[PDB]
């Protein structure tokens, strides 16, 4: 109302990530607010952000590629919504294993996805990523 | 170079365009 | 004369003289020709954060030079 | 009734800002009328100036073949609302871009639009207080930024406005040549019947001793600097008159 | 996309005379004094003016074969064909002379010597030998000198008459 | 899924040039950023696109009705969203059917165009 | 007498910064004089430095509340008029008690500002 400060990175993917069709889960909900909280998106364009999370929740890259060490911590474990919900997510029983899902999924993602993503010029490339994002948007 | 070897409403639209925008350049110069 | 062996260029020879010729003029008639002679003049790059970053590359006050 | 304030109140804050703007149509009345001298004592400085860089060249050529950093200097005016005057010029400046382009622009409009726009061109800018007189002093301020931001330049370019009438704001260019190519040129003006008008001129030149040639150079290249900022000036005053009383009369309308 | 240079817009040009041309008897010679992009005097007929330039003094007359003359700061003289002379003083600039009958004398400043004040000048070259013996560098003691020639030169032009 | 991108991106040029619009009557359109020019640019050209000569008002326009299929409605304003047809100029889409209608007219006006540039040049 | 003159400045303050903000939004705030801009920076200090936490809001503003004395507030006010702390971040005095409540936020906001400086300075 009134320079790329934190607040001011962090502020525009939280709206963007407010834009929903359907209702969320929860624990799907809270992880991408958590992880958008902490800078995990700070080197994800604000076009991407819902191709971001859509990879988060209805996919894992950790698993993809062969780099996941986490023991229980999973997006595809639906049961975690009422572990998360007692204990928080910032304590140390989920905390540690929640910010190693984070850091593999943001290496990951910036990696394979982002740099391809970046360097698309063709016409039918450009139109098949705008049908994307779109809908991704209108999935998570 | 192996593309060589073996190997239309849209085309009108871009033909237009190209003569359109030939004119608009053409008319710069004189 | 031995300004040039200085490394001073004939411009900035130029400005001083115009100083000092606005100097001698009387005080009744300083105030016009003195407004021709005020360095009033900087050069400056946007700075990372949003700020100025001033250039030192070229003197702005006579007594610099 | 709130509904009917709310009017009232948008209707107070029309008044409040045909108050400000019609401020600053004085202001900028009296500034054009201080710098309205210009206009009758212009048109005789630059005149060996002409002989020394009036050289109607083609636009491609020019161009095409640079090997050497092409420098340009566009005019801006510190403060908006001047009107289209800096519109214009980002677009022939866009025009013109290039792979040796490098951009000096003036003005706080310049910097901050040159900055965004071609980042790697821009180097860095000069400011001006518009408090005192435009004087010799800029001028080489800005000739001498100009060269250590590229001292094997192929050319500095200048583009400003020309203040035609008080209706009429052309774009004007001052291409200078640096001194290498300058002194080819000039010698080949004296060598020969070509470049006619300028054959005693290169002649008399040529005579005299380098550093005066270099000095001739320098100096000349100031007071065109000189004639274009104090032109871009008298066009900015006399565009901000124009464009505040459109301003003046759409919030009249209102 | 082609700009105009802004030399079209001026349209009081430089006439040169072919060299392969008769000759003409010039009793007037047209100056144009000029200061930071402002003409004191425009194609102004005159007697004769004198310049004090790097090498020495020049009376240019009409006629004058053409020539380039360095100004240092000086007084300069114009003497009208009425027999009325007006003196000013420039700091420093160029001269061109035409051998077609016209001189543009352009100046970084030219100021009429009426307006310099001696008691002003004299005192600021006491006070710049002072600062010449404090300046720091021969730099510092180069601009310091360049001050007190334009003053002693300031000086000697009003004391002249 | 075309369809709907496409009338969501127009509805979201639409709103913004309408907000823009504010700004440029009190002001003027040159105080504006750079980026927003372009956005009031497409934007006016959108607006002058919807509009359509009916085959009822021949009278009233003075002009012969368009019928314009959905296939084309969609693929013409979603070129005109990517930005291809810039360089075309904004009366060309006024009163006119389809992206083909659009480029005939900006053909005609080219023409008339260079014709009016070469009688000044030839007034020389 | 001290509590009248304080209260009627900073209403005179206020009533003031309210007419220089049409001139901000038009001119900007680079046309503003040495003078305006004073009373600029002052008096949107005093525009926070007004707002206070609750001990019943906790929840809503997540922090505790204060309980501030009648002279402390006077006094407070009565140098950021004179600008006794014009060098004070503006923030400062955001959600805050006392003026000893400012100058510790102060100093927490300048300790913070220098671990990210530090961290900048790595990288
Ligand atoms: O070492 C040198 C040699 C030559 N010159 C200068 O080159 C110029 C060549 O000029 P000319 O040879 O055409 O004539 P000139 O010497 O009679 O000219 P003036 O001195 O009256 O101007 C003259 O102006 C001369 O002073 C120098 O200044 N230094």
Redesign the interface.
């Known amino acids: 109302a009134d320079v790329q400060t934190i607040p001011m990175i962090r502020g525009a993917r939280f709206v963007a990530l407010f834009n929903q069709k359907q209702p969320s889960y929860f624990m799907n909900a809270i992880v991408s607010l958590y992880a958008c909280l902490n800078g995990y998106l700070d080197d994800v364009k604000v076009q991407y952000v819902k191709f971001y999370e859509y990879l988060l929740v209805h996919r894992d890259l950790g698993i993809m590629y062969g780099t996941a060490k986490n023991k229980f911590f999973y997006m595809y474990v639906q049961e975690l919504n009422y572990l998360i919900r007692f204990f928080t997510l910032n304590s140390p029983i989920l905390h540690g294993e929640l910010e190693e899902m984070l850091k593999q999924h943001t290496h990951l993602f910036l990696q394979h996805y982002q740099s391809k993503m970046n360097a698309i010029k063709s016409e039918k490339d450009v139109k098949a990523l705008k049908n994307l994002l779109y809908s991704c948007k209108r999935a998570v | 170079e192996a593309a060589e070897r073996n190997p239309t409403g849209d085309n009108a639209r871009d033909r237009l365009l190209k003569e359109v925008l030939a004119l608009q350049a053409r008319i710069n110069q004189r | 004369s031995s300004w040039?062996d200085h490394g001073i260029?004939?411009?900035?020879y130029?400005?001083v003289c115009?100083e000092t010729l606005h100097s001698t003029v009387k005080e009744s008639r300083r105030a016009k020709y003195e407004?021709?002679?005020?360095?009033?003049?900087?050069?400056?790059?946007?700075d990372g954060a949003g700020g100025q970053e001033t250039?030192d590359?070229?003197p702005?006050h006579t007594k610099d030079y | 009734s709130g509904k009917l304030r709310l009017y009232k109140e948008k209707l107070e804050?029309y008044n409040?800002?045909y108050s400000?703007?019609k401020t600053?149509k004085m202001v900028t009345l009296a500034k054009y009328r201080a710098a309205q001298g210009?206009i009758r004592?212009?048109?005789?400085?630059?005149?060996?100036?002409?002989?020394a860089?009036?050289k109607?060249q083609a636009?491609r050529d020019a161009v095409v073949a640079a090997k050497n950093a092409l420098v340009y200097i566009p005019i801006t005016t510190n403060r908006?609302?001047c009107?289209?005057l800096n519109?214009n010029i980002?677009?022939?400046i866009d025009?013109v871009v290039s792979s040796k382009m490098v951009l000096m622009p003036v003005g706080k409009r310049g910097?901050?639009?040159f900055?965004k726009?071609y980042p790697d061109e821009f180097?860095?800018?000069?400011?001006?207080?518009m408090?005192?007189?435009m004087?010799?002093?800029?001028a080489?301020?800005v000739?001498?930024?100009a060269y250590?931001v590229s001292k094997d330049a192929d050319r500095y370019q200048?583009?400003?406005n020309?203040f035609?009438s008080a209706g009429v704001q052309?774009?004007?260019?001052?291409?200078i040549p640096s001194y290498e190519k300058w002194k080819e040129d000039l010698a080949d003006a004296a060598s020969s019947d070509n470049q006619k008008?300028r054959?005693?001129?290169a002649?008399?030149?040529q005579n005299?001793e380098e550093?005066?040639i270099?000095?001739?150079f320098?100096?000349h290249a100031?007071?065109?600097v000189?004639?274009?900022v104090?032109?871009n000036e008298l066009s900015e005053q006399a565009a901000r008159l124009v464009?505040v009383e459109?301003?003046l009369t759409?919030?009249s309308s209102? | 996309?082609?700009?105009?240079?802004?030399?079209?817009?001026?349209?009081?040009?430089?006439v040169?005379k072919d060299?392969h041309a008769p000759h003409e008897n010039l009793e007037t010679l047209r100056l144009?004094l000029?200061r930071?992009?402002?003409?004191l005097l425009?194609e102004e007929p005159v007697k004769c003016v004198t310049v004090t330039g790097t090498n020495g003094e020049y009376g240019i007359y009409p006629g004058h074969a053409?020539?380039?003359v360095?100004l240092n700061p000086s007084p300069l003289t114009v003497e009208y064909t009425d027999g009325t002379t007006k003196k000013y003083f420039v700091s420093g600039?160029?001269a061109?002379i035409?051998?077609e009958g016209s001189c543009?004398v352009?100046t970084?400043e030219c100021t009429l010597l009426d307006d310099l004040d001696l008691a002003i000048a004299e005192k600021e070259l006491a006070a710049q030998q002072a600062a010449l013996g404090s300046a720091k560098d021969d730099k510092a003691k180069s601009v310091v000198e360049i001050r007190i020639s334009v003053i002693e030169a300031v000086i000697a032009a009003l004391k002249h008459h | 899924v075309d369809h709907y991108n496409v009338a969501q991106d127009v509805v979201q040029m639409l709103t913004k040039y309408r907000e823009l619009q504010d700004i440029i009557?009190?002001?003027?359109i040159?105080?504006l950023s750079?980026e927003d020019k372009l956005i009031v640019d497409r934007a006016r050209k959108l607006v002058k696109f919807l509009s359509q000569p009916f085959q009822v008002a021949e009278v009233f326009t003075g002009m012969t009705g368009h019928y314009v299929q959905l296939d084309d409605t969609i693929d013409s304003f979603s070129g005109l969203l990517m930005g291809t047809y810039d360089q075309v100029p904004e009366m060309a889409f006024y009163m006119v059917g389809g992206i083909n209608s659009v480029l005939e007219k900006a053909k005609k006006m080219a023409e008339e165009a260079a014709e009016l540039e070469k009688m000044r040049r030839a007034r020389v």
């Open positions: 040039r260029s004939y411009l900035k130029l400005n115009t407004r021709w002679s005020k360095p009033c003049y900087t050069a400056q790059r946007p250039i590359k070229v702005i | 804050g409040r800002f400000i703007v600053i210009r004592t212009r048109d005789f400085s630059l005149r060996y100036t002409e002989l860089f009036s109607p636009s908006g609302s009107g289209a519109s980002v677009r022939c025009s910097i901050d639009s900055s726009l180097r860095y800018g000069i400011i001006n207080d408090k005192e007189s004087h010799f002093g800029y080489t301020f000739i001498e930024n250590e200048v583009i400003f020309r035609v052309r774009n004007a260019v001052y291409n008008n054959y005693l001129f002649n008399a030149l005299e550093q005066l270099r000095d001739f320098d100096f100031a007071l065109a000189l004639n274009a104090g032109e464009a459109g301003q759409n919030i209102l | 996309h082609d700009l105009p240079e802004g030399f079209e817009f001026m349209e009081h040009k430089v040169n060299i144009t000029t930071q992009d402002e003409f425009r053409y020539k380039i360095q600039g160029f061109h035409n051998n543009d352009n970084v | 009557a009190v002001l003027g040159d105080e750079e």
